[PDB]
Amino acid sequence: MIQRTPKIQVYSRHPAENGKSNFLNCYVSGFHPCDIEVDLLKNGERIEKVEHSDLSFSKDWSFYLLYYTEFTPTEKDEYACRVNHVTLSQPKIVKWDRDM
Amino acid sequence: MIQRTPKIQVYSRHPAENGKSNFLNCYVSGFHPCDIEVDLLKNGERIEKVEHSDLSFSKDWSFYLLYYTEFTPTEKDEYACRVNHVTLSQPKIVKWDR
């Protein structure tokens, strides 16, 4: 497989509501090679106990990986996913759109 | 060292009986880093139609990956698993033994 840079989706499990518990997700996909670093951020700082799936792929070694954690959004807090990969010269930061 | 060379096991789901439908498996495990190439081979040639698990994280910080394929063995056909990994000087071929 050739080098391929990741696609990134950030989304919550349920329709977001301030003060209500939820799950925050970062899905990284279509990438190669498999080594990748992903943080979920709250107000720009790393969230510590985030979990992830295994590395999925179909016919080719083009990889798919989900990072997720419980969270309770509030009006003041903003969330993001930060991804580093060999294809990336600097970390890529994708903000969470509240509507997703 | 955090690099770990893959353990490679090649085995059929049932013991070998020419003519009966079976499964060929290559279980590659205990490796680090995750970057790896695994191919199932029939007579030295890559089998195009194969199945596999996720490339999976172990509790000891290593990885594993299973490749498998439906096949029907015969007396002539020979099978192997080829694995390439940073810890190996050249691709490693491990033959299947009935």
Numbering used by the authors:
A (entry chain A): 0 to 99
B (entry chain D): 0 to 97
What wording appears in the published article?
Physiologically, β2m is degraded in the kidneys; DRA patients typically suffer from kidney dysfunction that results in β2m accumulation in the serum following dialysis. Following our previous approach, in the present study we engineered a β2m homodimer where the DD strand interface is specifically locked by a disulphide bond (linking the engineered C33 residues of two β2m molecules – DimC33). Therefore, the unprompted dimerization of S33C implies that in solution, under native conditions, the DD association interface spontaneously brings together two monomeric β2m molecules, and only once the DD interface is properly assembled, the two facing Cys33 establish the disulphide bond, which results in the formation of the covalent dimeric species (DimC33). In summary, our study presents an engineered β2m covalent dimer, DimC33, displaying the same biophysical properties of wt β2m in solution, such dimer mimics the first oligomer formed during β2m aggregation.
In order to assess fine details of the molecular structure of DimC33, two crystal structures of DimC33 were determined to 1.9 Å and 1.4 Å resolution, hereafter named DimC33_low and DimC33_high, respectively; additionally a crystal structure of DimC33 in complex with ThT was determined to 2.8 Å resolution, and named DimC33_ThT. The three crystal structures display three different space groups and crystal packings. Overall, no major structural effects on the β2m fold are induced by the S33C mutation, either locally or globally, in all DimC33 structures. The covalent DD strand interface is structurally well conserved in all three DimC33 structures, where it maintains the same contact surface of 560 Å2. It must be noted that wide intermolecular packing contacts through the ABDE sheet are established also in the absence of ThT. In the structure of DimC33_low (present work) and in the hexameric H13F mutant17, highly hydrophobic association interfaces are built via facing ABDE sheets (surface areas of 805 and 970 Å2, respectively). Although such two ABDE assemblies are not superposable, the two interfaces are structurally similar and residues Tyr10, Tyr26 and Tyr63 are clustered in their hydrophobic cores. Notably, an extended ABDE interface between facing β2m molecules can also be observed in the absence of ThT in DimC33_low (this work), and in the hexameric β2m structure reported earlier. The reciprocal orientation of the two facing ABDE β-sheets displays a high level of variability, but in all cases ABDE β-sheets face each other and the same three aromatic residues (Tyr10, Tyr26 and Tyr63) build the hydrophobic core of the association interface.
